[PDB]
RNA sequence: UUGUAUAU
């Protein structure tokens, strides 16, 4: 299967082997764990001539290398370090194959790299081969990263077809493991006319989303980078449910984000809710201090509370200081209290 | 080591 040259190379016979020396063996070396490695760490520092010599032998069979466990790395280097003309010729070897490559283990990595370095016209042509297959790519283990990459790299205007495809399925995709990722990229890079409908659906299913294994990340994303209007809507869903949600493995993280990113008024209201409300005989704050997840919310509340409110929180915590030591999680609250005594 | 998500 291997040639004399590659054979002797594996056998560590050419410790000083150079690029020009493997002319006529590029494809063979490229599809070889050691060969590829060798080529990879030469193209970056090699000369334009050495790179063209390598390019000449991989252009025709480029697809073959793109979907190759070791070859995909060489093609990637050309997009990263190759010349404009080489990147363009590789982009043409990809034409008509975007979908199958995007769904490919190795191929999707080439597509992702190509999207970063080719011109907008080449990006738009690539993106368009995904037209009609958006959800399939989004739900694919390989394809979801190509979609994420398009959103990061391509002009928003050319991604309208991905937006049209998410309409009505935002809730479904936000609880999907790859989908929640694409939704976040959409919120960070797309246009107002595009993020608007996505946000409406996110607001409509906020209650379910905060508690979802994946949806909770999308809601936090909005609390951390969203417009104040959108943040307040999320906060108003949390209000009245601080106690119950802070005790939830998933929503607890969302109430922390609310505490941290709410407006001054909203923050005070959230903290007060658990400083006033009584959970049985003892306050809601006390039940929270003893919970495996809620204790984190209290600590965050102590951190962001205005000195006036922090004082109130400490006072509600005070009478319980000695009992807290007996609870697996209350203890952790004591630790936090050290920072303040 | 008090608590949740990405691929050769």
CB proximity A216–strand B (7 Å threshold): yes
Closest to A45 measured CA to CA, from A58, A56, A54: A54
A92 phi/psi in degrees, rounded to 5: -80, -25
Q: Which residues pair with A278 in a beta bridge?
A: A283
CB proximity A33–strand B (7 Å threshold): no
Closest to A206 measured CA to CA, from A249, A241, A167: A241
Q: Please, which residues have CB within 8 angstroms of residue A306's CB and are 6 or more apart in sequence?
A: A264, A267, A268
Cα(A55)–Cα(A49) distance, integer angstroms: 10
**Spacing of A28 CA from B6 C1' in Å:** 32
CB proximity A123–strand B (7 Å threshold): no
Closest to A234 measured CA to CA, from A304, A187, A287, A276: A187
- Which CA distances in Å does A285 have to A11, A206, A328, A335? 68, 24, 16, 17
SS (H, E, C) chain A: CCCHHHHHHHCCCCCCCCCHHHCCCHHHHHCCHHHHHHHHHHHCCCCHHHHHHHHHHHCCCHHHHHCCCCCHHHHHHHHHHCCHHHHHHHHHHHCCCHHHHHCCCCHHHHHHHHHHHCCHHHHHHHHHCCCCCHHHHHCCCCHHHHHHHHHHHCCHHHHHHHHHHHCCCHHHHHCCCCHHHHHHHHHHHCCHHHHHHHHHHHHHCHHHHHCCCCHHHHHHHHHHHCCHHHHHHHHHHHCCCHHHHHCCCCHHHHHHHHHHHCCHHHHHHHHHHHHHCEECCEEHHHHHHHCCCHHHHHHHHHHHCCHHHHHHHHHHHHHHHHHHCCCCCHHHHHHHHHCCC
Cα(A143)–Cα(A140) distance, integer angstroms: 5
Method used to obtain the model? X-ray
**Which residue is nearest to the C1' sugar atom of B5, using CA?**
A214
Cα(A272)–Cα(A310) distance, integer angstroms: 11
SS (H, E, C) A198-237: HHHHHHHCHHHHHCCCCHHHHHHHHHHHCCHHHHHHHHHH
Q: Which of residues 221-280 of A touch strand B (CB under 7 A)?
A: 249-250, 252-253, 256
CATH number of the structural domain spanning residue A82: 1.25.10.10
Name the pairing type of β-strands A282-283 and A278-279.
antiparallel
**Spacing of A250 CA from B1 C1' in Å:** 22
**Which residue is nearest to the C1' sugar atom of B6, using CA?**
A178
Instruction: Report angle CA A44, A47, A49 to the nearest 5 degrees.
Output: 125
Instruction: Give the nucleotide with minimal C1' distance to the Cα of A333.
Output: B2
Cα(A183)–Cα(A326) distance, integer angstroms: 43
**Spacing of A257 CA from B8 C1' in Å:** 35
Instruction: Give the nucleotide with minimal C1' distance to the Cα of A214.
Output: B5
Strand B nucleotides, any atom under 7 Å to a protein CB? 2-8
Q: What is the resolution of this structure in A?
A: 2.2
CB A201 within 8 A of CB A209: no
Range of the domain at A91: 1-341
Cα(A37)–Cα(A31) distance, integer angstroms: 10
Cα(A250)–Cα(A252) distance, integer angstroms: 5
Cα(A52)–Cα(A86) distance, integer angstroms: 8
Q: What total of structural domains would you count in chain A?
A: 1
The owner of tokens 């054979």 is A7
CB A185 within 8 A of CB A170: no
What is the Cβ-side half-sphere exposure of residue A251, based on CA atoms within 13 angstroms? 19
**Spacing of A222 CA from B3 C1' in Å:** 21
């Amino acid at each position: 299967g291997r040639s004399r040259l590659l054979e002797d190379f594996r056998n560590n016979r050419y410790p000083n082997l150079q690029l020009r020396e493997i002319a006529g063996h590029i494809m063979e070396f490229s599809q070889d764990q050691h060969g590829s490695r060798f080529i990879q760490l030469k193209l970056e520092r090699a000369t334009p001539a050495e790179r063209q010599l390598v390019f000449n032998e991989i252009l025709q069979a480029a697809y073959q290398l793109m979907v190759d466990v070791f070859g995909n790395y060489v093609i990637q280097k050309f997009f990263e370090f190759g010349s404009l003309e080489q990147k363009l010729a590789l982009a043409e070897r990809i034409r008509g194959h975007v979908l199958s490559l995007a769904l490919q283990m190795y191929g999707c990595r080439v597509i992702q790299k190509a999207l970063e370095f080719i011109p907008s016209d080449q990006q738009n042509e690539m993106v368009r081969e995904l037209d009609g297959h958006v959800l399939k790519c989004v739900k694919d283990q390989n394809g979801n990263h190509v979609v994420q990459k398009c959103i990061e790299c391509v002009q928003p205007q050319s991604l309208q077809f991905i937006i049209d495809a998410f309409k009505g399925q935002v809730f479904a995709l936000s609880t999907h493991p790859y989908g929640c990722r694409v939704i976040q990229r959409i919120l960070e890079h797309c246009l107002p006319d595009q993020t608007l409908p996505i946000l409406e659906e996110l607001h409509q299913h906020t209650e379910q989303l905060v508690q979802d294994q994946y949806g909770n990340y999308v809601i936090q994303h909005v609390l951390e980078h969203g417009r104040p209007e959108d943040k307040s809507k999320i906060v108003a869903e949390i209000r009245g449910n601080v106690l119950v949600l802070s005790q939830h493995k998933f929503a607890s993280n969302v109430v922390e984000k609310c505490v941290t990113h709410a407006s001054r008024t909203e923050r005070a209201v959230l903290i007060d809710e658990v400083c006033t409300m009584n959970d049985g005989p003892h306050s809601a704050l006390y039940t929270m201090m003893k919970d495996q997840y809620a204790n984190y919310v209290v600590q965050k509340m102590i951190d962001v509370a205005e000195p006036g409110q922090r004082k109130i929180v400490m006072h509600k915590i005070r009478p319980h200081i000695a009992t807290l030591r007996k609870y697996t999680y209350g203890k952790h609250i004591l630790a936090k209290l050290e920072k303040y005594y």
